[PDB]
Every structure is written in structure tokens, then in C-alpha cells.
Design a protein around this ligand. Structure first.
Ligand SMILES: Cc1cc2nc3c(=O)[nH]c(=O)nc-3n(C[C@H](O)[C@H](O)[C@H](O)COP(=O)(O)OP(=O)(O)OC[C@H]3O[C@@H](n4cnc5c(N)ncnc54)[C@H](O)[C@@H]3O)c2cc1C
Ligand SMILES: Cc1cc2nc3c(=O)[nH]c(=O)nc-3n(C[C@H](O)[C@H](O)[C@H](O)COP(=O)(O)OP(=O)(O)OC[C@H]3O[C@@H](n4cnc5c(N)ncnc54)[C@H](O)[C@@H]3O)c2cc1C
Lengths: 576, 576, 52, 104
């Protein structure tokens, strides 16, 4: 570890890695620090689902996810346990136990919010859905010229899509996928369009998908190396970044204070450029611990000196979920084109179809799989092949249905494998609402309570705003109930519900971007530069200042590509 | 990849790494194949609990464990779900669904048995408890000379302890450990002795333990390399080993058939020596797929040609568990030496003690930690420091209490997170019973159903034997109830219970060792050589033929070391 | 069930269970107010909660 | 087979049933409020020793039924409350409310 770099990046998630890819490639001497460790295979920061064992047992991946999601703010527990033995030590109050946060109102929390501290960040376990935002959901990068703003976002997204290897055809030959897609296309003919979820992923075989991650964006290997002999990059895992040191004039960051967790020593790292990409919660924490914003419980009677909008206007999406069990009609329709002789298990059994018959409701690739499955597993009562890939269907946010949707199967933290119903029958429904930014919705940090790394304890004061946000959330629930019934009935134990606030992990606006600090109530400009500071940049979903329903990471990455363009224009790499 | 090795080893768990450590060091050309992949970071095969993040959030590690444990044999599900929507598809039977095993009687199963497929095997997640077996539990290595047998086991276990870095001091300054240790010592004075659980682990700091694993035994780096230029080792992950090929006379193994899961290629690998260390289930599966034992439902009207005892005489330990909440008397005793004046939280409050006072119940180090906690955290009502390490207590198996005990905290698959009671108050109790080997207790493999890697499906036919095994398992439950009461009452939600059969993952006897194939109803001799075969060796808990209660891995390691001695005496390494 | 049906709890403390999955349109509490027959005088940790 | 072991509780002045002067019950009478903990000392020692006795004695008949593992029941679920208008010989010396004729 040197004491001096051209650029230091805090965090090795996909956004930090976007800065690394751009700046390392442009010849800067770059260090990256992560509080977490390489724990993840030979490919550093790669998706943990990309193992043979996980792709043969996807349900087990829910456990991996649970294992690395650490709750941000847990209120003081008030559960009454009054069946302890009379000899056991017994509480007289609900005192602060087990890491809980006494600052946290349990009724104004994002109790589902959590963070991951591992190299690659949450991209080691994420779902890889990377849709673009439409105008309605997106902040402006160019004022008073929509066509120009659109062109700039098209340019940025196109590059972000290449970095993540986003595509919309990796599930094109799944029967379950096309079954669901075709039925919904028909049911909403001329009202709503359906397509594959845009996924950051590359299909490697009919049973293996290489899901993208941070590693895809930047492989995190130290440079120079054989493959990049003129590049300079070092990743330092197990290092907690604690503070950026401001100059007295509040115009420049002068150093980064770090704590090496393995040795316990502290150090002061110098760079020309500092990029904070620690996630939406921890970028905010690091800033507040550095003198930006206001530490402690918000107190308006006292103006903060710097970035007064920091931690305000936070947004988290409403998320409604259910699972369904595919209708008899749709299952029957899978074999609609089959000719069925004799009985299963018997010499007489025969299942056939004619490749290319124009009377066929399905393509040949489909009928061939159905025929083969039905003939090779005559004990099985379903027409869907065992290895058929999962559905991955969406109808993207529109003004007339202002929510994002995913009609799919994937692992999340609130997964629950159930074993009783055949898994080929099951489809997950997740609709995601947009949340209006309001000043009163805040992430703040205690001036007395600290977290497990001795940093100020994050506290939320959040409610979903009344008015459009609330009305839309409920309309979204009803839309999921109505749309899902086209495919099948609810699965018992996964009935339609709102999910715990924050479980969706789409938190935005904690360090929000705009054109003018005061007018747009914001913290960073459109180059992701912290107002007033020459050399401090923030990346991530914390920058997004709007109400959005779609998954935000692609949009964060795009902002980050725009930020690196500024940096390249304004700082000169040191001599190699 | 080469065509030809001196030694090939199937599996990279700690038993295969024992073979590697011995045989790479003695100059053999060694290849090792594992069906799983590297996924503990840069130290290949290391303990996954060795991150800062897990040691600050140990309960989250239960999810890691659950994530990698795959159930061996799941019977067909017969749960009634009768509240599906009428439009949803439903079969008319409980058909074979979701990977279940139609061979398996649900009432004669080890439903908790599970396997892990990752480089380092189960040692990437294990508890690291490495006790020695006393004579009562231990197979004989020398018959008719008990002191010769004693000396041989002492020499082997001492070696094994060195490989695993086993010690009994890593928790010596934990207040919770010493509170429990001291109380149990005093209460059973004259009857039972207590000590620290022997742990394969090295303390790095007061808040971090480096838990041992396969990596500690052998670092699994390919050789030659700078640190080992005269050594020859290749590790090949993501390779399923499927069969060893017998010569016509059943006197030698001729090759090993493997399937590379990434390329799909299949190869026959040749070696002078073949060592199988794939675990107690998968060793057995590989052998039965290679024409040892009997494939299919056991059929006594049809003696197998080879290894008649293979998969019979299986033993799994009964496991009883509870958690307790520390007694008010014990908690008050933590502070017995303190003089406490004033009211907590006021500037008049003080906690002091008299250093060195002959009448102090605790040592100065303890009282200092108590004092510092109470003064620095006046809002907290307990005297136990927040980062105090967990208890790690045992009274080892003896004839008058013929069960192993762990009185501790650690992460297992059945962990259940608890939030209303302070974790400092909670102690886990796990008592482990020994199970008599009976011929009727079997692991067999389907001749029609295959598993996810297309190998014969494991099936259990198991019940705990009546007579001594069942009597002792109940006496053990009572013992836990009696002993645990000395410390505190049970924690609601963790009441005293038997655990699902096999969840303890201490399965033995599947390929058991003995002196004489026929008289001792066994598969390998005391060199772990398969009877009849000059060049085939099995390692692991499958070899253990006795009824044991303590954790088996150190003993299996000691057997592997002995095996390696035989290999050194009988096979010459190839010129390097 | 007959027994359950005729045993009426003597003192039930104010309920502090967190329900944070209501729809945003539903009316919700800013406090754990006295609800559903509960007894605001009762310390939940010094009760005979099964008395009826 | 069901096993129920019932412990005795030392009468302590601080263990009280009292009635609110503002909150009322469903029949518009003063609402009952408890202030109770099992006394430290003999009551608590006996209660734990009583749990241990049930575990030891039950094991002679059979092992526990899953889902009915040994536990303490919620305080008061036993409905054996006493001492709320206690008897004795002398109102002051025996801290009581009725004499041995049950007369107030
Ligand atoms: C199960 C799952 C499903 C999701 N699915 C999707 C989806 O389909 N589409 C999508 O767009 N989003 C999804 N997300 C969210 C997505 O993963 C995140 O938006 C994304 O990873 C954010 O990237 P980032 O680089 O800003 O932050 P993170 O990925 O959170 O990385 C931040 C990093 O910084 C580190 N760090 C934190 N504090 C410090 C400090 N003080 N010092 C040093 N390092 C620090 C961390 O250890 C971490 O590695 C999902 C996430 C989860 C967990
Ligand atoms: C949570 C938990 C706690 C435990 N606690 C303890 C404890 O405290 N003390 C203790 O003694 N024991 C404990 N154990 C058990 C201990 O981990 C095992 O006894 C030990 O790991 C066995 O070592 P092994 O090398 O024989 O087998 P394994 O560790 O199972 O390794 C066998 C390996 O072979 C591989 N393999 C399997 N099939 C094939 C194939 N066909 N081809 C190629 N490779 C294959 C696997 O991928 C695997 O890595 C615990 C286990 C767990 C999971």
C-alpha cells in the first residue's frame, strides 16, 4: 500500500467498479478500498450464483443472500417473554440489547433495509435486472432540451449496458417464459407491452447462466499485470474507510482516513481524486462522519454548515409480492399441438407433432422439448421439461401503470422454498412502486450510538408519502391481483402482500444530484461532484433524486460514467 | 491436466488434504479432484467464518451453512394443500416432484443428513471441535496390546492436532466461558471434569479467531511453486469423480473415470494409488457405482461379489439441544468483587475493586473488564462486556456419562435467531450420544433413481438401535436437563429436544475398518486399504467402525495419517 | 375451545407489535395507543398475563 | 401423557393486585392491574428444581412429545391465584384482611 494515489475509490460494488474500469483504463494510479473481504471464487467480486451447485439448487441461494444482508437499523425490541424460569436473569426494562438502535422509531423505519460488506458488494447476490428509466422516472442531465437530454441518457445507458452485458434474449427458448409472455401479450393486446426483463447475464449453456456482477465491470485484479502491463490498480479488502478530511476552506478533500481491520492500524491515504461508492447508506455515513450535513437527530434550529440536503428526500420503493400456481388451461396449452397415442408407461404410448404445421400454436423448438420430455418421463404428469429455464417477463413502467414489474423466478432474502407444489408450476410476481422525494424522509446518524465498526448508527425517519405515492401503491396491489389471475391462482403461503419497507433494497436520494445545490435541494451536481469541493465525487443510487419504480443500478452506473468523463477532463494521471 | 499421477485423491475436504499434506511432502506426484468449486477467497479451502464481518455477525453464519448443505435423501412429499384456486393445475397424486427420492421410507430416514460440494468440503463451515476418543469409543489399531495401541493413537492424534492447530486456550479470558466453566467445575467436584472444548483455531486478536479448515492442513496451491519447488500437486475443482475401474481379478484399481462439469468432457485418469475422501455418503456412492457392494434395494438372496459390508453398520449420533438464559445468581456473581456506589448514569456513580485481594473471587483481568464495561456503559444493566468471547466448555465422554458435551455458542444449520433476550445471557447445550453399529442400519443406492449429478440416489434405512443406544440417548437428554439447570433455565423457543436424525452430520461406519473382512464385517483394514486391492484407500468418518459420541474428524484424520504411512512403505514416488 | 371461549384476560398490556406491511392507503397509527381493551396501567414485565 | 408440576409462591408484600382510579373494565368497574414477580429466594430455587424434577421423572415414562417440550407456562395461566384478601388471626401482626371465620 502506497500513501499516494491519483484516485481512491471507497467500495468495490458495481459502481465503484465502473469508476475503476474508466479510470484505470485511462491510465490513473487507482486504489480501491473495501470494508469487506474477497470471499467469492477465483473471479474477484463475481456473482455467487455462478457455481454449478447453485444453478442445480437455486433455492439454496436465498440462504447466501440472507447470510450477507446485515440490517441497517433495528429498533429496540419490546417482545414480552414471560415464560423464562424464575432463576434466569430477567429484564426490568426493554433495554438496548443485541445491537439495536434506541434512536429508531419502529413505526417510521425501513426495517427491511440492509447492507452487504463483501468485495463486489451486493452485486455478488443481486438479481441482475437492469432496465432503463423513461423520462418520467429519470433526472434531467440537460435543461430545456428534451431531445438532447434523451440522447445523453441513451449514450450513457448504452455504455452501462455494455459494461454489465445486459441483454433481453437469454431466456428466449424457455417454455415457461414464453408461456407467460404470450398469454399476457394476448390479454393486454394493444394496452400494455410485455418483454423479457433486461438482465445483466450471458447464457453459457442451456442450463447455465453467467450472471453479471462487479467482476464483469472490472475484474478487480491488481495491475500492472500480464494482461494490462501499463495500468495501475490496487484493491485493499478488509479496510474500513472512516473519514474524508476537509480543508478548512471546505474546497478540497486532503486525505482519506482508513482502518485496516486485519492489523488494526489506522492510516491517512492521499489522492488527487476521492470517489465514494460505499452504497446509499454508507456514503451518507462516511460524509456525516466527515463533517458534511448534520450529525445527530435533525435539529432545524441549527443549520448544518455543509450539504444541508444530505440524508433528506430519501426514497425507497413500495414492493408487492405474490406467487401463483399455473392454471390448468395454461398447462394444457403447453401440449396443445401434441398428438397423444396409447398410455404412459406402456408399449402403445406415443406423443407426436409435426415440425412446421401452420396449425401449431407453438414453435418447433417448443414442441420438440415437450414431446421429448413427455416421451422420456412417462411417469411425470406435467408437459414442462425439468430443465426449462425460469420465466423472466416484465411490462415496464408507463404513466397508465406507473410501477415496474417482474414476473419471474429468482432468489431474494424472503425466499421460501416450499416442497409440496411442483416448482415448474410456480411464478413469482413483484411489482415496484415509485416514491415521491420528500424533505421529511430522512437517513440520519446518531451522535452517541455507534454500529459494529464504531461509526455513527444509521437511523431512518421514513413513511411512504400520502397522495400519489400511496394511491399508486394500492392501485399497484390491485394490478398484481388482476394480472396474476390471468396466469394462475395464488400459492398458499405466498399470498399478495406488501413487503417490509426497505426489503426491496432500492434506496435512493440519500446524497441526491441536481443542477443547483439550493434550488434543487441536492448534494452533488451532474458530474456527481460534491458542491463546493474540487475533488470529491459520489456514485450510486444515493445520487438519484427522482421517484422511480424500476431497478436503479443501471441508472446509477450511467451517472457514474458521466462523472468519470469529468474526472478525465479535469485531472491528469501521474507518470507511470 | 496429465494422463498419469503417482496418487489421485477424490475430495478436498480435511481428510483428502491430510493425504495431500503427507504425500505431497514425501515427494509423490499428486492430483486431487473435487466436484465443488473454490469459494472461500484467496486461501483455497479456508474457513468461511474467518471474515471480520462474520465474526461481528456470527448468527448470520447459520445462513452460510444452510446454503451449502444439500439434503442426502428427501422422501416424497405428502403435505396436503387444499386451498389452491380451482383454476390452478393440480395432480391427483403425490407424485415424484422436486428432486425427492421415491425409494426412501420417511420413517426410516436420516432426514437431516446433508453434504457440501465445495473445495475444503465441510471444513469451510465446521465447528472445529477436535476431541480425542477414549478407548471406549476408538477402534483398535493393535489387538492384544493395549499400551502399544495407546501409544500408536497418542502419536497419531498428536500429529493430527498439529495439522489442525488444535488447542485448549483460545477462550481462556472470556468471562462467559469462565463463568460456566467455574460453576460446572464446582458443582460436579469429584465427579466430572471440565475443560475448554479442544478447538482447531488460532486466536488473532481479542475479537477474531482464525478457525482451522482444510486449508490449515494443506493450502491446496498448485505445486511446484516458489515456496515448494520440489513438490508436485494439482487441484482440479468442478470435476465429478464417477467410478474407479477394477481389474478382472479384483486385485487393483486401473483408473478413475471423471466428468469435467465445466467442459462436459470425460476422462480416465491413471495413478499408482487411488484415495477416496469424498465423505461418508459419497465414498460409498462411488464404490457402489464401481461394482463394490450391491446396487439397489438390499437383497440378501443375492450376496454381492465384493465388500458385502459396504453401507451396512452405519452409525449416526443422537443429538439433544437446548439453550439456557443465565441465572440471576451467576450474573450477580460476575460483579461479586466490585464496590458500586451511586446511581448509574450520574456523575456520582463509581465502580471499583481491590486488585490482588486474596478474597476476590475473580482475577484482576476479569474485574478490570467488568469495571471498564460498567463505567463506560452505565445504561447497560449487565456486567458482561459487549465483546466478550463465547463460552467453549466440555466434559468429555466417560463410562458413567457416555456422551460428548458442548456448552457453548456456535453457528449450525438449525440456528434460530433470537432477539428479545440479550445474547450475553444465552448458552447452547449440545450433547452427542454414541450409536451401536447394526447390520440392519444401511445406506444404499437406487438402481433406478439418480441424483443431481446423475449418480445412484442415496437411500437410508435407519433407526436408532433399541437397547443401549436408545437407553443412553434418553439418559443423555435427562443429563442435559439436569446439568443445564445449574447455569440457567431454558430459553423459550429453544427447549430441550432431539434433533432431526442426521442433522449432527457425524455419520460413520459406511465403509468401516477392521482387522478381518469377514470376522469384523468390514471394508478396509487398519491401513485404510480396501480388502483385496493393492492400491485403493478410503479416508474419512466412514472408516470408523465403533459407537462414538465425540466429534469424529480428528480421529478420521489420525487414521488417514496411518494410511499414508502404509503408502510410504509400499509405493515409490516417481522421479521429479 | 369451550374453556378458551369463556376465559377473559384480567389485564392485557398495551400492544407494541410492529406491523409495517400495511398498504400505504390504510389508516395507521403514529403510536402504540390504548387499543382493543388494553390496560395502559400494566407493566408488561410485571404481569400475570395468563390470569383470566 | 401430560405432566404438570405446580410450585408454591412465598407471600410478599410487594406482589400486588390493584385497581386503576381512571381506567375501567368492560363492566365499568376499576380496571385490575398486577405488579408481580416470582420472589427471589426459595420460590425461584424451588421452581427451577421443580422443572428439573419433571424432566427426570417424565423420562421414566417416555421421551418428550415434539411441540410439548418442557416449559414454564405464562404467569397466571394456572388460575390458582390466592392471597388477595388473605386470612389470619390478627389484622396487623399477620398482615391480613379476614379472620379464621372469613369475616372482614
Ligand atoms: C438480492 C438482491 C437483489 C437485487 N436485485 C437487483 C436487481 O435485479 N437490479 C438492480 O438494479 N438492483 C438490484 N439489487 C441492488 C443492487 O445490488 C445495488 O443497487 C448495487 O449493488 C449498488 O451498487 P454500489 O456499488 O453502489 O453499492 P454496493 O453494491 O452496496 O457496494 C458498496 C460497497 O462498499 C463497501 N463499503 C461500505 N462501507 C464502506 C466503508 N466505510 N469503507 C469501505 N468500504 C465500504 C461494501 O462492503 C460494498 O462492497 C439487488 C440487491 C440484492 C442484495
Ligand atoms: C456446520 C458443521 C459443523 C460441524 N462441526 C464439527 C466439529 O466441530 N468437529 C468435527 O469433528 N466435525 C464437525 N463437522 C463435520 C466435519 O466437517 C466433517 O466430519 C469433515 O469435514 C469430513 O471431512 P472429509 O474430508 O471426509 O469430507 P468432506 O468435508 O465432506 O469433504 C468431502 C469432499 O469430497 C467432495 N466430493 C464429494 N463427492 C465427490 C465426487 N464424486 N467427486 C469429487 N469430489 C467429490 C466434496 O465436494 C467435498 O468437498 C461439522 C460439519 C458442519 C457442516
Amino acid at each position: 500500500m502506497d500513501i499516494k494515489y491519483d484516485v481512491v475509490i471507497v467500495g468495490s460494488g458495481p459502481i465503484g467498479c465502473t469508476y475503476a474500469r474508466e479510470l484505470v483504463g485511462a491510465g490513473y494510479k487507482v486504489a480501491m478500498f473495501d470494508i469487506g473481504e474477497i470471499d467469492s471464487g477465483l473471479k474477484i467480486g463475481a456473482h455467487k450464483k455462478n457455481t454449478v451447485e447453485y444453478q442445480k439448487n437455486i433455492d439454496k441461494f436465498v440462504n447466501v443472500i440472507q447470510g450477507q444482508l446485515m440490517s441497517v437499523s433495528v429498533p429496540v425490541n419490546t417482545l414480552v417473554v414471560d415464560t423464562l424460569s424464575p432463576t434466569s436473569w430477567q429484564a426490568s426494562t426493554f433495554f438496548v440489547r443485541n445491537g439495536s438502535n434506541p434512536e429508531q422509531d419502529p413505526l417510521r423505519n425501513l426495517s427491511g433495509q440492509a447492507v452487504t460488506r463483501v468485495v463486489g458488494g451486493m452485486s455478488t447476490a443481486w438479481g441482475c435486472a437492469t432496465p432503463r428509466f423513461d423520462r418520467e422516472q429519470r433526472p434531467l442531465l440537460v435543461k430545456d432540451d428534451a431531445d438532447a437530454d434523451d440522447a445523453e441518457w441513451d449514450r450513457l445507458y448504452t455504455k452501462a449496458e455494455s459494461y454489465f452485458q445486459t441483454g433481453t434474449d437469454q431466456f428466449k427458448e424457455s417454455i415457461r417464459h414464453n408461456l407467460v409472455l404470450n398469454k399476457l401479450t394476448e390479454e393486454y393486446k394493444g394496452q400494455r407491452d410485455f418483454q423479457q426483463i433486461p438482465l445483466a447475464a450471458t447464457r453459457r449453456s442451456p442450463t447455465f447462466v453467467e450472471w453479471s456482477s462487479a467482476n464483469t465491470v472490472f475484474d478487480l485484479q491488481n495491475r500492472p499485470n500480464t494482461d494490462a502491463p501499463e495500468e495501475r490498480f490496487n484493491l485493499f479488502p478488509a479496510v474500513a474507510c472512516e473519514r474524508v478530511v476537509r480543508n478548512a476552506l471546505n474546497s478540497e478533500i486532503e486525505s482519506l482516513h482508513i482502518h485496516d481491520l486485519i492489523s488494526g492500524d489506522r492510516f491517512e491515504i492521499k489522492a488527487d481524486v476521492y470517489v465514494l461508492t460505499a452504497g446509499a447508506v454508507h456514503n451518507t455515513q462516511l460524509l456525516v462522519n466527515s463533517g458534511f450535513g448534520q450529525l445527530g437527530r435533525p435539529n432545524p434550529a441549527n443549520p448544518p454548515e455543509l450539504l444541508p440536503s444530505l440524508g433528506s428526500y430519501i426514497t425507497e420503493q413500495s414492493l408487492v409480492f405474490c406467487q401463483t400456481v399455473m392454471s390448468t388451461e395454461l398447462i394444457d396449452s403447453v401440449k396443445s399441438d401434441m398428438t397423444i397415442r396409447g398410455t404412459p408407461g406402456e408399449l402403445t404410448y406415443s406423443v407426436t407433432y409435426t415440425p412446421g404445421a401452420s396449425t401449431n400454436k407453438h414453435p418447433d423448438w417448443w414442441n420438440e422439448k415437450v414431446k421429448n420430455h413427455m416421451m422420456q418421463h412417462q411417469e411425470d404428469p406435467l408437459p414442462i421439461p425439468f430443465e426449462d429455464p425460469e420465466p423472466q417477463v416484465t411490462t415496464l413502467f408507463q404513466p397508465s401503470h406507473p410501477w415496474h414489474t417482474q414476473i419471474h423466478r429468482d432468489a431474494f432474502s424472503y425466499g421460501a422454498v416450499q416442497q409440496s407444489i411442483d416448482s415448474r408450476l410456480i411464478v413469482d410476481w413483484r411489482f415496484f412502486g415509485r416514491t415521491e422525494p420528500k424533505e421529511e424522509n430522512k437517513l440520519w446518524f446518531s451522535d452517541k450510538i455507534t454500529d459494529a465498526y464504531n461509526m455513527p448508527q444509521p437511523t431512518f425517519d421514513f413513511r411512504f408519502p400520502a397522495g400519489r405515492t400511496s394511491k399508486e401503491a394500492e392501485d399497484m396491489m390491485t394490478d398484481m391481483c388482476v394480472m396474476s389471475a390471468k396466469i394462475g391462482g395464488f400459492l398458499p403461503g405466498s399470498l399478495p402482500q406488501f413487503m417490509e419497507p426497505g426489503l426491496v433494497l432500492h434506496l435512493g436520494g440519500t446524497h441526491r444530484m441536481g443542477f443547483d445545490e439550493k434550488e434543487d435541494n441536492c448534494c452533488v451536481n451532474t458530474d456527481s461532484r460534491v458542491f463546493g469541493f474540487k475533488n470529491l465525487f459520489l456514485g450510486g443510487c444515493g445520487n438519484i433524486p427522482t421517484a422511480y419504480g424500476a431497478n436503479p443500478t443501471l441508472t446509477a452506473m450511467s451517472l457514474a460514467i458521466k462523472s468519470c468523463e469529468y474526472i478525465k477532463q479535469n485531472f491528469t494521471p501521474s507518470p507511470f
